[PDB]
């Protein structure tokens, strides 16, 4: 057999999947993840896949550090993953504009509160739920004709911006955790225009 290698955590909005190599020839894998202070819990058993969904484990506590290991068996050798702390490390997903509306000489732009895989009882917690005041949004607004790169920032889910009369603007939003070291920013939302 070959030991697994290049173990990576693929994660967005807490949806979390460990990946590795190689594509197995005459062998199988079993993944074990560790609470770090309990034990080695397997989540995948004797699979021919080179990935394991670990969402259900990390969403139990997203402010924990997780280790994983991948055992190799013939159709024994193992390898330790890098450390993964979900809260600090998981990628923010692409946001969606909920609504824009022309309130007087200003425009209101609302971002959807994105749902995550973190679960508490019977609620699937949202970005806002998990991150709270650590979460900020950025907006970009312009009419694609003269292209005026004007920026707005909000602590909530709503922007209140100044606009020119009769002018059709285009909008795109971004999710931002200023506090982070890595993956501070989501990808941009689909553009919405008047």
């Amino acid at each position, epitope marked *: 057999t070959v030991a697994a290698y290049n173990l990576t955590w693929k994660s967005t909005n807490f949806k979390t999947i460990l990946e590795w190599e190689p594509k197995p020839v005459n062998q199988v894998y079993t993944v074990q993840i560790s609470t770090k202070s309990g034990d080695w819990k397997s989540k995948c058993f004797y699979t021919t896949d080179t990935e394991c969904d670990l969402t259900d484990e990390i969403v139990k506590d997203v402010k924990q*550090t997780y280790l994983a290991r991948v055992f190799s068996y013939p159709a024994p050798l193992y390898e330790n993953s890098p450390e993964f702390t979900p809260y*600090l490390e998981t990628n923010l997903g692409q946001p969606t504009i909920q609504s824009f509306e022309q309130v007087g000489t200003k425009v209101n732009v609302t971002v959807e509160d994105e749902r995550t895989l973190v679960r508490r009882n019977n609620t699937f917690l*949202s970005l*806002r739920d998990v991150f*709270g*005041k*650590d979460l900020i949004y950025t907006l970009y607004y312009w009419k694609s004709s003269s292209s005026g790169k004007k920026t707005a920032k909000t602590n909530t889910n*709503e922007f209140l911006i100044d606009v020119d009369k009769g002018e059709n603007y285009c909008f795109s939003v971004q999710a931002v955790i200023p*506090s982070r*070291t890595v993956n501070r920013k989501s990808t941009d939302s689909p553009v919405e225009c008047m």
Partner: antibody
Amino acid sequence: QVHLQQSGAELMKPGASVKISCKASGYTFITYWIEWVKQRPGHGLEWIGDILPGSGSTNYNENFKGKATFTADSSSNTAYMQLSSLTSEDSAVYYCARSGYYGNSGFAYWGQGTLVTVSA
Amino acid sequence: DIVMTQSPSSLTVTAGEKVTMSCKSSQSLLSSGNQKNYLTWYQQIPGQPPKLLIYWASTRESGVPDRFTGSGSGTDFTLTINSVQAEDLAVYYCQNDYTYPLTFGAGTKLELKR
């Protein structure tokens, strides 16, 4: 259990500084904010700001800038606040607490405090 | 700054009664995005630092008994210690838990008559 450990009680003279340590056991050090809180005898509670270990981010209460210094050594499980130019409005009890597990869930755990006493 | 004024400033009651105190942010802790009142509650008894009571105005923290009850929306709130225990003896503070700066109440001095 989670345990915030604040450094022992201190006396300093109305001039130079004082380093206070919050040593946190019982969880993952880097993923929760630590909080600094002044409490005076009969004054309610006062929020100096916060800091996230592992990314070193900080937010100060504007009335203090000039006074407070938040730091934490990731790799020794301890957060730090230094206070300069000590005075009487500095003499108080100082508090370290952990952020919320569920996002905006207040302060959850608190350090036992430390009395700052400022006189010659 | 979101200022918080608590009231009554103090209050003194007998064991067993029901108590109510009000908390009022200078403007709204209502995140219309997901309908949450971003207010928080502390109990501070003699000889110990703040105990966290309730988050999101009306979510009871693990352990904390069901006889305390948070309520209100936006800029008007209410801890109601229903059927006061003697051990409930504290000063309670609500705390803005929404936007920076992080702020506090004046505090509410609960004392016990007997």
